[PDB]
Design an enzyme around this catalytic site. Sequence first.
Site, short mmCIF file in Angstrom:
data_model
loop_
_atom_site.label_atom_id
_atom_site.label_comp_id
_atom_site.label_asym_id
_atom_site.label_seq_id
_atom_site.Cartn_x
_atom_site.Cartn_y
_atom_site.Cartn_z
N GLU A 1 -6.85 -6.27 14.72
CA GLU A 1 -6.99 -5.08 13.87
C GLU A 1 -5.64 -4.67 13.24
OE1 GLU A 1 -9.31 -3.51 12.51
OE2 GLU A 1 -11.08 -4.20 13.55
N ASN B 1 -9.56 1.22 2.54
CA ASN B 1 -10.85 0.55 2.30
C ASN B 1 -11.32 0.81 0.90
OD1 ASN B 1 -11.60 1.65 5.61
ND2 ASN B 1 -11.03 -0.44 5.00
N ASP C 1 -14.11 2.04 -0.20
CA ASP C 1 -14.82 3.33 -0.31
C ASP C 1 -13.90 4.54 -0.28
OD1 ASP C 1 -14.05 3.70 2.39
OD2 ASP C 1 -16.04 3.74 3.18
N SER D 1 -11.87 5.44 2.05
CA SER D 1 -11.48 5.80 3.38
C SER D 1 -10.28 4.94 3.81
CB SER D 1 -12.65 5.65 4.33
OG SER D 1 -12.89 4.31 4.63
N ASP E 1 -8.17 3.17 7.35
CA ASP E 1 -8.10 2.83 8.77
C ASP E 1 -6.67 3.03 9.29
OD1 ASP E 1 -10.80 1.95 8.47
OD2 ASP E 1 -10.11 -0.09 8.12
N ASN F 1 -11.25 4.76 11.47
CA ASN F 1 -11.56 4.98 10.05
C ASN F 1 -11.67 6.48 9.73
OD1 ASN F 1 -13.88 5.07 7.67
ND2 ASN F 1 -12.50 3.36 7.40
#
EC number: 3.2.1.17
Length: 129
Positions: free
Chosen positions: A35, A46, A48, A50, A52, A59
Amino acid sequence: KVFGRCELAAAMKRHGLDNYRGYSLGNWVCAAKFESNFNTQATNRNTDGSTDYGILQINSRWWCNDGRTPGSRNLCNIPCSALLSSDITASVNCAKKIVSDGNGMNAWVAWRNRCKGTDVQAWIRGCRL
Ligand SMILES: [Cl-]
Ligand SMILES: [Cl-]
């Protein structure tokens, strides 16, 4: 902070992750490897809108507030910036809630794609745990 592999395993064990909801420690170290490369300061935006955050890439749509994700939940009730600390407590507390949520560790795409069904014990091999 960029953790060592066994150092991370050890901090995770201390915060209750070994066998949390049936996932042995190797799973959580592996997830963190893929990750974030063990870096607490990792961020990834991301498509969209958002973002992380942290060692476990938690998220902003669901779990933490970063102030720029419209109509997002803050299910862990933290600013996302708290996930980027060298102290892994907040990331570990938010992850325990995520993994209880129904998908288990499938919520982490790197785990599903890179750790699940592999010999996850390798990731804790040789560590004084
Ligand atoms: Cl393990
Ligand atoms: Cl599960």
